[PDB]
Amino acid sequence: MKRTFQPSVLKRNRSHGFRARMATKNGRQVLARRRAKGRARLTVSK
Amino acid sequence: AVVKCKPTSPGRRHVVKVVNPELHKGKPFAPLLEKNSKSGGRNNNGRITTRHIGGGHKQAYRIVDFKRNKDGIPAVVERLEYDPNRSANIALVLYKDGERRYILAPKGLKAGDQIQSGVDAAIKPGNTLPMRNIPVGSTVHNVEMKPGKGGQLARSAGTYVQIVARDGAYVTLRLRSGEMRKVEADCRATLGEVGNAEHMLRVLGKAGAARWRGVRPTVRGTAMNPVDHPHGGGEGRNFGKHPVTPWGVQTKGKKTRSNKRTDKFIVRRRS
RNA sequence: CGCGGGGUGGAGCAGCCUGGUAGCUCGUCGGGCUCAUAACCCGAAGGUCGUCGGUUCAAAUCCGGCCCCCGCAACCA
RNA sequence: CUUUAAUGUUUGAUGUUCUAACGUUGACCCGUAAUCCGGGUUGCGGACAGUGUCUGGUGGGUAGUUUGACUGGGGCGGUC
RNA sequence: AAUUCCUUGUCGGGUAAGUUCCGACCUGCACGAAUGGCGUAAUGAUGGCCAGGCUGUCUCCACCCGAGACUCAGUGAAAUUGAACUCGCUGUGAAGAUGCAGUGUACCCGCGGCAAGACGGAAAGACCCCGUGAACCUUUACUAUAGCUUGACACUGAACA
RNA sequence: GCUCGCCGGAAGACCAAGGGUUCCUGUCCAACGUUAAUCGGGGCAGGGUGAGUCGACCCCUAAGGCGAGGCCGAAAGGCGUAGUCGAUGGGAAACAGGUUAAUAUUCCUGUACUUGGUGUUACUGCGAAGGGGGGACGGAGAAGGCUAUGUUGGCCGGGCGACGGUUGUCCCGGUUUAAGCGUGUAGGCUGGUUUUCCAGGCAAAUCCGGAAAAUCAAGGCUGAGGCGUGAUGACGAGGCACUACGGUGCUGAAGCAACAAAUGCCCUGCUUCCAGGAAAAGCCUCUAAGCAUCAGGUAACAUCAAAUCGUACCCCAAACCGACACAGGUGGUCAGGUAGAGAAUACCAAGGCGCUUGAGAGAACUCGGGUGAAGGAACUAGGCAAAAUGGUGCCGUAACUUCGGGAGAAGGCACGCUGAUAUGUAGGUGAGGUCCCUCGCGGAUGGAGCUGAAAUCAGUCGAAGAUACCAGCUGGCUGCAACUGUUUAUUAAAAACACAGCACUGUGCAAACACGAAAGUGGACGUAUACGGUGUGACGCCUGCCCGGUGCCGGAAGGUUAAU
RNA sequence: AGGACCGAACCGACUAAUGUCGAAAAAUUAGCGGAUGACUUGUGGCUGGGGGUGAAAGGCCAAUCAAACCGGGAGAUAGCU
Numbered sequence A: 001m002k003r004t005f006q007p008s009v010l011k012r013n014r015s016h017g018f019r020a021r022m023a024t025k026n027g028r029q030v031l032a033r034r035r036a037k038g039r040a041r042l043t044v045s046k
Numbered sequence B: 001a002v003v004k005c006k007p008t009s010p011g012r013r014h015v016v017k018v019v020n021p022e023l024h025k026g027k028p029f030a031p032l033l034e035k036n037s038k039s040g041g042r043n044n045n046g047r048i049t050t051r052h053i054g055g056g057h058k059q060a061y062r063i064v065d066f067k068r069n070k071d072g073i074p075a076v077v078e079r080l081e082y083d084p085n086r087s088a089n090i091a092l093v094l095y096k097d098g099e100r101r102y103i104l105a106p107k108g109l110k111a112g113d114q115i116q117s118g119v120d121a122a123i124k125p126g127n128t129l130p131m132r133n134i135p136v137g138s139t140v141h142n143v144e145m146k147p148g149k150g151g152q153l154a155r156s157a158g159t160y161v162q163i164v165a166r167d168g169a170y171v172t173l174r175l176r177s178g179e180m181r182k183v184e185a186d187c188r189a190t191l192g193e194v195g196n197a198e199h200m201l202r203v204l205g206k207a208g209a210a211r212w213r214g215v216r217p218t219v220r221g222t223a224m225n226p227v228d229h230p231h232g233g234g235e236g237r238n239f240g241k242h243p244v245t246p247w248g249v250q251t252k253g254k255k256t257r258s259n260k261r262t263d264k265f266i267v268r269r270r271s
Numbered sequence C: 001c002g003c004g005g006g007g008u009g010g011a012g013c014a015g016c017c018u019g020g021u022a023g024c025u026c027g028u029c030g031g032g033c034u035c036a037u038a039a040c041c042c043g044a045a046g047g048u049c050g051u052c053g054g055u056u057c058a059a060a061u062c063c064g065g066c067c068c069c070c071g072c073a074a075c076c077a
Numbered sequence D: 001c002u003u004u005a006a007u008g009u010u011u012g013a014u015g016u017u018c019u020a021a022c023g024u025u026g027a028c029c030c031g032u033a034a035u036c037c038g039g040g041u042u043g044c045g046g047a048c049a050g051u052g053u054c055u056g057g058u059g060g061g062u063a064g065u066u067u068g069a070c071u072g073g074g075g076c077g078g079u080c
Numbered sequence E: 001a002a003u004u005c006c007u008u009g010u011c012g013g014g015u016a017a018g019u020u021c022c023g024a025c026c027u028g029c030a031c032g033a034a035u036g037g038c039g040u041a042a043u044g045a046u047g048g049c050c051a052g053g054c055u056g057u058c059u060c061c062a063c064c065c066g067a068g069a070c071u072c073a074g075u076g077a078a079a080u081u082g083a084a085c086u087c088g089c090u091g092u093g094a095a096g097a098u099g100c101a102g103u104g105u106a107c108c109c110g111c112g113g114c115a116a117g118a119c120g121g122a123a124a125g126a127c128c129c130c131g132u133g134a135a136c137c138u139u140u141a142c143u144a145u146a147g148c149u150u151g152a153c154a155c156u157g158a159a160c161a
Numbered sequence F: 001g002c003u004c005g006c007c008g009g010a011a012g013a014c015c016a017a018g019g020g021u022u023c024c025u026g027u028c029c030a031a032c033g034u035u036a037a038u039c040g041g042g043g044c045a046g047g048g049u050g051a052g053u054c055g056a057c058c059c060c061u062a063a064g065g066c067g068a069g070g071c072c073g074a075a076a077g078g079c080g081u082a083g084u085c086g087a088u089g090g091g092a093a094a095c096a097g098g099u100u101a102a103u104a105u106u107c108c109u110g111u112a113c114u115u116g117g118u119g120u121u122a123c124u125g126c127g128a129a130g131g132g133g134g135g136a137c138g139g140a141g142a143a144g145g146c147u148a149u150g151u152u153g154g155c156c157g158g159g160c161g162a163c164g165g166u167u168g169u170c171c172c173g174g175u176u177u178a179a180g181c182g183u184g185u186a187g188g189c190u191g192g193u194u195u196u197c198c199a200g201g202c203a204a205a206u207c208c209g210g211a212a213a214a215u216c217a218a219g220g221c222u223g224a225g226g227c228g229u230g231a232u233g234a235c236g237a238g239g240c241a242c243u244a245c246g247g248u249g250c251u252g253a254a255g256c257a258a259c260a261a262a263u264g265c266c267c268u269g270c271u272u273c274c275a276g277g278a279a280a281a282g283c284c285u286c287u288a289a290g291c292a293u294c295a296g297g298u299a300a301c302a303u304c305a306a307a308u309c310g311u312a313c314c315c316c317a318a319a320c321c322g323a324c325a326c327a328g329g330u331g332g333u334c335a336g337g338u339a340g341a342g343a344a345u346a347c348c349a350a351g352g353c354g355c356u357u358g359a360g361a362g363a364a365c366u367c368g369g370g371u372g373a374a375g376g377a378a379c380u381a382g383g384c385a386a387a388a389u390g391g392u393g394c395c396g397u398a399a400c401u402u403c404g405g406g407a408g409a410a411g412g413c414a415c416g417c418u419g420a421u422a423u424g425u426a427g428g429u430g431a432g433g434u435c436c437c438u439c440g441c442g443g444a445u446g447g448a449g450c451u452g453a454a455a456u457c458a459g460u461c462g463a464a465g466a467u468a469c470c471a472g473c474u475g476g477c478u479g480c481a482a483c484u485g486u487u488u489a490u491u492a493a494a495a496a497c498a499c500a501g502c503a504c505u506g507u508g509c510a511a512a513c514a515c516g517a518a519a520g521u522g523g524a525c526g527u528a529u530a531c532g533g534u535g536u537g538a539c540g541c542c543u544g545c546c547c548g549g550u551g552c553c554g555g556a557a558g559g560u561u562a563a564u
Numbered sequence G: 001a002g003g004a005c006c007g008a009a010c011c012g013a014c015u016a017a018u019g020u021c022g023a024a025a026a027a028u029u030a031g032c033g034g035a036u037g038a039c040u041u042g043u044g045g046c047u048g049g050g051g052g053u054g055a056a057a058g059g060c061c062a063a064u065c066a067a068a069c070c071g072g073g074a075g076a077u078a079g080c081u
């Protein structure tokens, strides 16, 4: 069976990378939420 | 021509092809080729605006001349090439000055004739001249809407417009559909009917043909679920709801024509 | 076997709704026209209103029972 | 009073013509090494078209809801 | 008949025997011409039926081969579970009793199997019903409504007839 | 260490992707391992990943993302021009051998090549955001010529044998060698050279395109492999010196031929068909503004530079994805011998494993299999399942038919080995020598050697010769659907969908419709032989009557009627 | 030439048995269909929630779909248990 999650560093980045998040109003808003809650792995990249 | 095939295999039975031994067997003229990116009915907004479109053998847009601005320069037709964009056939004209250029192929004209344009230009197939310099009654293809616009009428494998009336600064045409519309006099067109009239009898045969042709399967409404098509529903072929499009729009008889900016040009509705 | 509707000259249907008064076409009978029949024309007869019982001044009609006939229902576990 | 008369008067109804608003997904030029956009000449249109407020109609394309109860189980029937 | 309720209709074929199958009969409850009708070679992991081949499907099972099952060694779960000193029977009982009444029977405890019961385990039954529950779907239910369309004013002018 | 069994189109060896120290050495065994554990992908300490040439980075674009201004929108924001990102593609350059406890096309040895800076020198018109060429291209087919690789022979080295024979036409192993440079072949493409002129290429052009002359014949372009050279160097069987007895230091023979032959290469070819098969830069060529003393450009030579990151291991799995050391899933490459059509299949090679519980017992019952007396579907919802059929060649083969089918219809017969035909045939490949020569990788002839079908004849073996693995069950009546195909991931694969074909109807271009407040896109860089919608669903015969009701289209007299 | 035929790789999923607190939250074993195309597949884009996509099942959209997931209205409401 071909289980759902297929690994792809590149795809994962353009989709959920810092610069990916930082691109839009919502993404910048999303990060602001993580910052206040004090999450450590803010985005996922490198 | 109307060539028949043999029933060696199913699907290969009903096939009948328009195969011509006149069309150039080589590759086209390079300086007149551009890529055309296909999109399966998808607009810039990502969605699918027109259904059924997708797939298909890759193509390359062959640039064609429509306005035929260059006038008074005699040219000879070099060869007759095949284009997968039009239902017509394109000719690789060769102007006297060396400017090679494509034009739509008129009736049985062949590779080697000499055709020109202008106002001096004589009344011969493939020739181009303003219709106000063209006799009433003769039939012309590749008709231009506005002076300098280019030519947008009857240019699909066999279509041909016939000049009808000399209305001062206007001329009136009987369109292939049957509708008759006054167009501006000063416009230009090309004598004779568009070649490849036999294109009518091209029968594909196997379903596959349509696929590489570029069209996708069509799903009838009454087979869908009510939640999708207005017809929909039924415990097996139930109906009786005034046939409409998949937008509730009445089909099978419904005038959608509403421009109001162009009623002035159309004399009599299509027959 | 429940519910809806009807039964009227020899045949098929009106009038029944609101009680008094039953009509139409065909069929029959007699005459004429024709050599004879059909056709056509003239004139006349023919009804218990499914049956019995109620209410009423009086019942084909409005109410009830029974009989017959037609249609529909008679499902969900 | 009935409905008639000619002139002005208050406008209307369409029909023709013109252009100066407006449209131009027509031509050429400039910004500009630019099929976007704007500006400028010329042509076609032309007070229509198209847009906003108001308004009749259409309008299961779309949305929110209604669609009773008793009942010798519920429905159908009958009923209140 | 993929359609015929009455019906396994009736006649014939196939059978020793045929509610299916095959060919006809029209009495079509309630086929039928593009929501197509009647055919049709070829194709079909298609439905039904017949014959031949072939055989443990079977008559009616027998033997053998291996992997478990079984014993010894190590490791070591799970659903479930009011408490149990947890028998049969006739009756009684919230109406099907291991537990009540009467009577019979039964030394205490393990192991390998078998599933009749413990209204056995599992999932606050999906069937039924109810609630002035919800959800989508329908239309000539209601009330609105995007869009389409009509007209009036503004954008919006000028001369004649 | 010795046997044994299994894979071997892998259960082997390389990479991507992804993991992220699992690699290797020492060392410990509490917890992890479905058992013990000295062992381990476990803990702990240490070590290990060297690049001008592989890759990334970089130059250049596709789909698509973003987007100065700009158009548009209650805000947010949407789309999009100039541009600028974006490889799954194009673009410069290395091969062989040796070496570690683990790294190597990176380190050492030999032998090269590539792109630029600068300079010396002999010379010379250079020059873009510009024009042209080039890049630059589909499917299928057919062989032709080769190489990988293999087989056999010759040669060299070793052996002559645990039980009968074995100096022999006998047995085991080796029999290797790259890129680059020279050479320019099999074969493919295209006729070249000079002169004059030109409304063509947004300017210009000696370049390209076109038009004529004249002239000459072949020129030129592309291109596997083979033969030299690289290389009197390396590898090299096995001895020789020492064994820390794991290995190491030295040494070192033969080193050629014939044939078979790829799905690899020539071939980003040729033939052919239709469905008509990227872009851009690098690269070459030609000019504009400008610069001519130069600057720049071409060629030889010298000198210098090639930075930064990745590089260990796993990579059809114990490390990736599945909660686990999970019978599952995961793209590309190399792919030997015998038999065989074959990458099937069986036994083996190199190489890798025995699947992380075992030892007995030999009951029922369960699972996977083997065989079965006579009968042979009586079982049963149903021949479900099993068994059975199975290959090559030749003969032979119906109804119906759209004339291709049905058809491998059905049904049969012959298949091993040995010799002869023929001390191996037909066929294939083909050296010697001779003749010629426009002289080399040449043109003919000639035929040794080597490889080797298919068939006939006779004899013989067994029960059985397509013996194993492998490998159609066949036929008849009939409904439905034309047909290959698609579909309910995870109980439904069908008669359901689609389908070519047909009909109706809409739409004259700023098209109808569609997404979208809008702009703008798709439709279509198409224009009625086009496109959208609907309904039947190949082909053949054919498609009747009804406009009452609903809906749709045409009409305008009157009634009625909104805002005003 | 062929949506041509037999048949591995490859893709698929008809039948039967095993499993059904599994080896495994859909596989194994033996058979099976297509296997030059309407084929299949790697890498990367694009479409999105009454919206997308759909050879159409009301199938699928991260094991979740007749309206996903997460946060928030929100201690929704519950004549019922």
Ligand SMILES: *C(=O)[C@H](CCSC)NC=O
Pocket: C077, E127
């Ligand atoms: C009624 O048919 C019902 C069906 C149950 S399906 C689990 N039967 C109840 O006994």
